Design a binder for these strands. Structure first.
Ligand code: NVP
Lengths: 527, 402
DNA sequence: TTCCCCCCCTTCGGTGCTTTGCACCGAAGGGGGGG
């Protein structure tokens, strides 16, 4: 109760609530006055005269502070993120405290009490403490409790205390008998500031249910996921299943959601049915089989090193585990986002590696050592040749298939004796019809009519015609930067089946060289 | 104190804080605990909504960590306090001096306090590992290192400190950009080093704690060159016509009509072509035309310079500084460990040269992933300033610079 | 009929060539754990 207040202001050109008379049913009007008299006894609310032109609507089930919440100054964000259990250090004893009337045990700013005017139909009063339901109250309470708790930790540093809103988790390596006397010291210290923490016999016992995790002193797990049972699923049912699987992936290894994420495409209606294909149902059954048994994480030990295995489940989906001792995961997860229309496995490995890098910086404060399924020379060639910049922090190869390898590679200089093609593609922009074909140096020629393909598509599949009508040693000349940019990146997957067929042709050939020449210069066969 | 006005009708700095390593957080905690005793920083409460990012770095051949605050949003908002109130005219002879030495005078900003109404705008937060505790917040009580208004207020003291020196040695050129001082002279290395040391002492007796040579004659924009083959082939000739066709836009005195005349019918790319003498003349004349500098390319203060970096491979990066496309103010190569480290050093060198030449850092276009850069750019950085960087999404398909 | 803090995926809007089709990217929807 004897706590320095926080000086609150208001935004420029703003005032307090101007709310007019509020109608209320008589039985509620008479009944609620007793609480208002009670609160005023200890001084939480104080009667005021007519100097206040502010009034607040009355609700019974509670005050509608929305007018103040909108017109009040902006504050600093109270919770920029919550811990992750994987990063928590292991404590021999852990205890939970809950301070009672916490939002009422911190005074309010003197100059701001005026704006919290509330009238019972009618007599008025103003809040002398942090009003509940207010926008800025949680931040002020957090600051106040930080100030209160600091001295105790200053004398005793062997304990660690965490403040989740009203809750105070206290952990230590002291013996149980000696830990209880420390928790009694904390209780006395919070009593000295007037905070209603419970007694010994009312304290909670492990595990603790926090933010969706069951926290034990020496392990942690996730809240049990009850998988929906729907023989006829819908949009909402699939969305809920996907959300719970994404949430549950952090401790259950190897969970696929992409097959089920596909079914949620292009459904404007909330209720319209979407049948589970063979693939989606098979994946769902496998996920149920995974979630059948319970698995637990462990607590970070800052005297040992961090290892982050990374496996590939196929189809652009990656799983990873993080541990310190073998077979004891600190954390698990998956990376499955597709970025861009065209990419290959090495680039997705790179994106996964940097994802885990950022998450491990946030949670553990340091980058782990990757054990990647890629050959050293493969990665070396890729980063030396690629046009961007990238650097995987530290990694070693793991001989656990499936591995990563670029399925093909182009040639740098034209091949002697290799058959040479001069391709082109055009399409009528108005009618979406066109032609595509090539003129080989030896004399072979071929042209194809085309419909429902744009200029880019026809220029891209002229390469397909050339590859079809070729041998193994081929020198294609293109008059298109778009197709050149698509092919030159070594893609091994795409959202275009045309490019899929092109890639399938390109993997077959032993040596393919492709070159580009300008348009409208009439160069050789092009014209 | 000197009152500071924000650009009218704008908000304040509301920027999230990037996660940091354990080492760079222990460094920040120690540095800020030591700074609070001197009264430079002041712990603040929940009534302050603003924030600017904070990192820790190391200097050249230095072990002590150094705090570094990103003030780019604050500068974009407070550039009214500079453009109107102090526009320093950039010396022109700085580009030619034999040696320019760069010195750090940021500590001299700690003496002069900051406007009390403005302080709330410079709030920052040291976060915690795993969000275990609420990050400890602070505010500047004296002028910070990183703001564009900090040197503008201190102009008088530095002029007063440097005038007893400028009177004696009128040949040297002294320029100030942010926390950094560029002193340029034509002396030889042995005399120049001792001159810079005694100059540091002149400031030290004035009460400045001041703790590196770029040769501006070497900083000359590079020429462009046509490829030379004693033996010409169809693939080699086709490549040249495209390279020249690209070159036509940037230098419009380049012609490829006769050069393309040989290439008229399908021919194996590998086959050799005897080169005709008339075409040989266009090739011979064109190589010389490339050497001739472009006309109309003069620095304009109204716009902002944009810098492109292209990885050419094997440690080589090529960059171009252009106010508008196809009109390059400068052009060069950087040759060099790592690959993000190479791009970091390239960015630093390009912007140091740009500060020397035109007096302002460019807008960088980086050939790197946004997330990899934002994770690792702070690990090899060693400069108190920070430019404005964007990132590119498509390969450099032309790539006709090296 | 609240404020939203993160995790994930899809849909969609703006930008910039690779130019009136197409390439990434961030900003709207939902789900999950929240208080
Ligand atoms: C929710 C939470 C957040 C941060 N730390 C903890 C907790 N709660 C715990 O119950 C806990 C469990 C195991 C280890 N540390 C824990 N504690 C720590 C303080 C002793």
């Amino acid at each position: 109760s004897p706590i320095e207040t926080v000086p609150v202001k208001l935004k420029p050109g703003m005032d307090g609530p101007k709310v007019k008379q509020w109608p209320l049913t008589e039985e509620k009007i008479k009944a609620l006055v007793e609480i208002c008299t009670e609160m005023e006894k200890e001084g939480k609310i104080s009667k005021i005269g007519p100097e206040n032109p502010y009034n607040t609507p009355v609700f019974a089930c509670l005050v509608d502070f929305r007018e103040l919440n909108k017109r009040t100054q902006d504050f600093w964000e109270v919770q920029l993120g919550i811990p992750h259990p994987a990063g928590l250090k292991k404590k021999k004893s852990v205890t939970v405290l809950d301070v009672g009337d916490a939002y009422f045990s911190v005074p309010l700013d003197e100059d701001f009490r005026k704006y919290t005017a509330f009238t019972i139909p009618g007599i008025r009063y103003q809040y002398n403490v942090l009003p509940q339901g207010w926008k800025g109250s949680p931040a002020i309470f957090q600051s106040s409790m930080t100030k209160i708790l600091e001295p105790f930790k200053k004398q005793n540093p062997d304990i660690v205390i965490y403040q989740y809103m009203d809750d105070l988790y206290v952990g230590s390596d002291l013996e149980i008998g000696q830990h209880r006397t420390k928790i009694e010291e904390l209780r006395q210290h919070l009593l000295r500031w007037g905070l209603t923490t419970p007694d010994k016999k009312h304290q909670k016992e492990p595990p603790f249910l926090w933010m969706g995790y069951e926290l034990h002193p020496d392990k942690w797990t996730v809240q049990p996921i009850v998988l929906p049972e729907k023989d006829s699923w819908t949009v909402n049912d699939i969305q809920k299943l996907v959300g719970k699987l994404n949430w549950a992936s952090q401790i259950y290894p190897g969970i696929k959601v992409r097959q089920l994420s596909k079914l949620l495409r292009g459904t404007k209606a909330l209720t319209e049915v979407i049948p589970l294909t063979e693939e989606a149902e098979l994946e769902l059954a496998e996920n149920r089989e995974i979630l059948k048994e319970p698995v637990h994480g462990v607590y970070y030990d800052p005297s040992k090193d961090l290892i982050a295995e990374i496996q590939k489940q196929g189809q652009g989906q990656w799983t990873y585990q993080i541990y310190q001792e073998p077979f004891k995961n600190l954390k698990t997860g998956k990376y499955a986002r597709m970025r861009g229309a065209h990419t290959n496995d090495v680039k997705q490995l790179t994106e996964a590696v940097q994802k885990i890098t950022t998450e491990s910086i946030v949670i553990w404060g340091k980058t782990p050592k990757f054990k990647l399924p890629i050959q050293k020379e493969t990665w070396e060639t890729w980063w030396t040749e690629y046009w961007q910049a990238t650097w995987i922090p530290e990694w070693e190869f793991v001989n656990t298939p499936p591995l990563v390898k670029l399925w093909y590679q182009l040639e740098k200089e034209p091949i002697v004796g290799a058959e040479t093609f001069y391709v082109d593609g055009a399409a009528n922009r108005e009618t979406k019809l066109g032609k595509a074909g090539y003129v080989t140096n030896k004399g072979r020629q071929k042209v194809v009519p085309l419909t429902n393909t744009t200029n880019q598509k026809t220029e891209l599949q002229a390469i397909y015609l050339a590859l079809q009508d070729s041998g193994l040693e081929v020198n294609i000349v293109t008059n298109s930067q778009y197709a050149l940019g698509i092919i030159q990146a070594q893609p091994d997957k795409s959202e275009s089946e045309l490019v899929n067929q092109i890639i399938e042709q390109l993997i077959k050939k032993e040596k393919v060289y492709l070159a580009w020449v300008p348009a409208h210069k009439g160069i050789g066969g092009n014209e | 104190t000197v009152p500071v006005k924000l650009k009218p009708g704008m908000d304040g700095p509301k920027v999230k804080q990037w996660p940091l390593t354990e080492e760079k957080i222990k460094a920040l905690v120690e540095i800020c605990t030591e700074m609070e005793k001197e009264g430079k920083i002041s712990k603040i409460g929940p009534e302050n909504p603003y924030n600017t990012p904070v990192f820790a770095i190391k200097k050249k051949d230095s072990t002590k960590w150094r705090k570094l605050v990103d003030f780019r949003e604050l500068n974009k908002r407070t550039q009214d306090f500079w453009e109107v109130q102090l526009g320093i005219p950039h010396p022109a002879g700085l580009k030619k001096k034999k040696s320019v030495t760069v010195l750090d005078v940021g500590d001299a900003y700690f003496s002069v306090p900051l406007d009390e109404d403005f302080r709330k705008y410079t709030a920052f937060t040291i976060p915690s590992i795993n969000n275990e505790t609420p990050g400890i917040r602070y505010q500047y009580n004296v002028l910070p290192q990183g703001w564009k208004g900090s040197p503008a207020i201190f102009q008088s003291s530095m002029t007063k400190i440097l005038e007893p020196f400028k009177k004696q040695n009128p040949d040297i050129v002294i320029y100030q950009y942010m926390d950094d001082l560029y002193v340029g002279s034509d002396l030889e290395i042995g005399q120049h080093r001792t001159k810079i040391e005694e100059l540091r002492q002149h400031l030290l007796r004035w009460g400045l704690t001041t703790p590196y040579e770029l040769h501006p004659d070497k900083w000359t924009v590079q020429p462009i060159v046509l490829p030379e083959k004693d033996s010409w082939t169809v693939n080699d000739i086709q490549k040249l016509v495209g390279k020249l066709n690209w070159a036509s836009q940037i230098y419009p005195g380049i012609k490829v009509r006769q050069l393309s005349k040989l290439l008229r019918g399908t021919k194996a790319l590998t086959e050799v072509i005897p080169l005709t003498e008339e075409a040989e003349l266009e090739l011979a004349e064109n190589r010389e035309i490339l050497k001739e500098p472009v006309h109309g390319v003069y620095y304009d203060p109204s716009k902002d310079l944009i810098a492109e970096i292209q990885k050419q491979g094997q440690g080589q990066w090529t960059y171009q500084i252009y106010q508008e496309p196809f009109k390059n103010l400068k052009t060069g190569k950087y040759a060099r460990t790592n690959d993000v480290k190479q791009l970091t050093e390239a960015v630093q060198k390009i912007t140091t040269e740009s500060i020397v030449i035109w007096g302002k850092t460019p807008k960088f276009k980086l050939p790197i992933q946004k997330e990899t850069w934002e994770t690792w750019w702070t690990e090899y950085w060693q400069a108190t300033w920070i430019p404005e960087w964007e990132f590119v999404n498509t390969p450099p398909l032309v790539k006709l610079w090296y």
